[PDB]
Amino acid sequence: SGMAMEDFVRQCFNPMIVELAEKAMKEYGEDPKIETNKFAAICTHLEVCFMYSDFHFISIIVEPNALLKHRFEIIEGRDRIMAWTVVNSICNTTGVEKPKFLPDLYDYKENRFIEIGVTRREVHIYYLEKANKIKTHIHIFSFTGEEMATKADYTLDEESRARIKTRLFTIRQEMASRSLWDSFRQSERGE
């Protein structure tokens, strides 16, 4: 029925992530109870976008004093209007070229937008498909603990990246234990 994946998703992710994913799905005519893999992919992509942004200020790491600037602006998880409202703001502030497609983050240290990709397939092939459908720096994470980033520029320190890669390796294993991995993987478009 999809009950099994749906319940896994609700206990895997925190309630903010879950609410945001449900919100995104209802907005576009999608029921979280029915398209349960999508439900899991939407949550996972949010968590990675938030993990990537956590703790980073200007350029230092803090786990938060009042004069610090957040290193990253977060564009994902906002409706389209708001999403574009925020990109316009960054473009006025910084003078950066406005991208043609919505990105996921803006990095105020490097002054570039970031496309974060997450895939159950292999990391390189997915990177290449994303680089073809797009200036915007791309960074892909796989569920098996890999990443690929534009020009071998990984933006963050290794410990930060290890935290996201381990988070994702762990979701795979937890799903795998429940005999849900194989079907979650297979549902992703492409080989």
Ligand SMILES: O=C(O)C(=O)CC(=O)c1ccccc1
């Ligand atoms: O797939 C991703 O990694 C996205 O980050 C997708 C995204 O934001 C989007 C924006 C406009 C239309 C459809 C997807």
Ligand SMILES: [Mn+2]
């Ligand atoms: Mn996005």
Ligand SMILES: [Mn+2]
């Ligand atoms: Mn993305």
